[PDB]
Design a protein around this ligand. Structure first.
Ligand SMILES: [Li+]
Lengths: 74, 35
């Protein structure tokens, strides 16, 4: 299928409710929330969690943002 | 920048956007596929 997974589209719609210069900060907050609420601790899972969050503007075609910069994982 | 500019409030935008709930679910789904 050429259309994206429905959940990804819902995420992109939520991201579009924010200004570009808020997107990376809020995605970092969202990643921290997932990591702690779900107890994600395995190193590769934690790294992939934060990477996925930082790439979401680009996964969503939020062209004014690109990929969010790396910040040390807690 | 001025007192009557757009003045984005990122934490308020986050809560208004349902804390990016669908993004959180997506992030979680991708994370557990690692390796
Ligand atoms: Li501010």
């Amino acid at each position: 299928p050429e259309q994206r997974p429905p959940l990804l589209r819902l995420c992109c719609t939520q991201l579009h409710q924010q200004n570009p210069q808020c997107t990376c900060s809020t995605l970092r907050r969202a990643a921290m929330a997932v990591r702690t609420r779900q107890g994600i601790s395995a190193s590769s899972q934690v790294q992939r969690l934060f990477e996925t969050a930082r790439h979401l503007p680009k996964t969503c075609n939020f062209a004014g943002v690109g990929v969010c910069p790396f910040q040390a994982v807690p | 920048a001025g007192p009557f500019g757009p003045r984005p409030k990122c934490p308020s935008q986050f809560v208004s956007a349902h804390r990016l709930s669908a993004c959180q679910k997506w992030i979680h789904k991708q994370a557990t596929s690692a390796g």
